[PDB]
């Protein structure tokens, strides 16, 4: 936490880098120094350093080296594309593919390791978990190494590092991850690591994409005669069904308890499941009808420790997304009423809309206000800010809805409106290419530039 | 086509109609903030923690050390705090019933009293700290307003 001091120390870094791996607390110190300064990471991180770290990990066979290597991939918990690419290249080559414990499915789960003595030991995943629970040097070492390797593999695939995801997914399939997570016999730490790996290697892949709740632009023909509560989801209309079921079941079970955030072992699993749920919701997999019940459960799991604060913040973000979806539904209802008009009755419908099924609560809204008030008294700055924003927003929904209705720009126009559909189709391919030949990108950019008083429209 | 004209007219009429109740909803929120303990379950630890205007002190501290975090949030908090200490008046018979119902559902010399309560919370230090730190027009202006 000293940019000037960090730069001054890094000024003479070659000596520290050279004196790495001699049992002195320098490799960890070096990693800590290059933990926030993205510029420092770019300047001091190269192929040689990654290769040296990999060789040290191979020689020592200790989890600490793997954890230190993994921590370098993410800078300020945001990204490090150059460092991530280098780490993936160094740790994905078949030659180096000996320090990572392989996992397989047999009729269950079995983990195979190469041992420090170049051996080949295969142990049942359930049997290995039972042995670790019993307590043994070999079992404890295997469990720690597996956890560290899973964490490092998940970190390597942070953001969209497809160069490594394409291999990690094949190495550990989504179905295998789901089967492992839904065990309840293995230690909580391993389950949390598996959940994080699944979230960061098979949830944010190419297929899924982010969703914007409040679509400020709507198609005139799209609006139906009347929009029911299910309509907002039926009109919208994937494969990880078991993942969603497990997430819902775990969240419900956590809610149906006293002091839900009490056990650290279960606390980590809850902090992973909440993150998975937030990612799925932001990905649009869930629907509004089920979203209401999910939000009710989440609020119930908050009424009346960094992990606890992070979980509360994630729950608040999910609730904010649900509120945005509700505002979108209200705007859709207003637009549907206007279309039905093709007066004062519309006034009554509007007054009755923002007054009810479309309510994220179970005690007439008192629950949300109580939770927000309780959170406001909390300590964490992000939690306090989120609670204050939510409290100031909830009791002022009418103004926000009116402002949203004042920004809706219908596209009932002629084929000129179809230019909007053409632009959307082009932007789909543009984003697909951006995520991951150049002729198509150049043509799309040229077409967009050509398409871009009509300038304002 | 010309449907845009009809849509804009309907939007304007709806906004004009809703204007009477927007202030009522804001007043309902202000009242809820005025007596936060009234909402939480009586006798609970939150009742004692919030008994001495705990929410007020926490909000004041957050607003003071929140200008850089989000200017909009600080401005909104200051406006709400000023509205709370700014008396009240009939928001229209049309919206009076709505405000009463909202207060009931969300909650099962007076100017001098609330002013003294805010001063005890430490709003004097809040306003002076906002003033003698910031050149942002809205921040300093709203501190003067408070």
UniProtKB/Swiss-Prot annotation, chain A:
Domain of life: Eukaryota
Subcellular location field: Endoplasmic reticulum membrane; Cytoplasmic vesicle, Secretory vesicle membrane
Binding site for Ca(2+) 1: 160, 435
PTM characteristics: Phosphorylated by AKT1 on serine and/or threonine residues.
Binding site for 1D-myo-inositol 1,4,5-trisphosphate: 2-4
Signal peptide: none
Effect of residue 50 to M: In CMT1J; decreased inositol trisphosphate-mediated calcium release and altered calcium homeostasis in patient fibroblasts
Tissue specificity remark: Expressed in intestinal crypt and villus epithelial cells.
Domain text: Composed of a large N-terminal cytoplasmic domain (CD) followed by a juxtamembrane domain (JD) and a transmembrane domain (TMD).
Record: disease: Charcot-Marie-Tooth disease, demyelinating, type 1J: An autosomal dominant demyelinating form of Charcot-Marie-Tooth disease, a disorder of the peripheral nervous system, characterized by progressive weakness and atrophy, initially of the peroneal muscles and later of the distal muscles of the arms. Charcot-Marie-Tooth disease is classified in two main groups on the basis of electrophysiologic properties and histopathology: primary peripheral demyelinating neuropathies (designated CMT1 when they are dominantly inherited) and primary peripheral axonal neuropathies (CMT2).
Role noted for this protein: Inositol 1,4,5-trisphosphate-gated calcium channel that, upon 1D-myo-inositol 1,4,5-trisphosphate binding, transports calcium from the endoplasmic reticulum lumen to cytoplasm, thus releasing the intracellular calcium and therefore participates in cellular calcium ion homeostasis.
Entry similarity comment: Belongs to the InsP3 receptor family.
Oligomer and partners: Homotetramer. Homodimer. Interacts with TRPC1, TRPC3 and TRPC4. Interacts with TRPV4. Interacts with SIGMAR1. Interacts with PML and AKT1. Interacts with IRAG2 (via coiled-coil domain). Interacts with CABP1. Interacts with TMBIM4/LFG4. Interacts with CEMIP. Interacts with TESPA1. Interacts with TMEM203. Interacts with BOK; regulates ITPR3 expression. Interacts with BCL2L10. Interacts with CHGA and CHGB.
Protein name per UniProt: Inositol 1,4,5-trisphosphate-gated calcium channel ITPR3
Interval of the full protein contained in this chain: 566 to 1192 of 2671
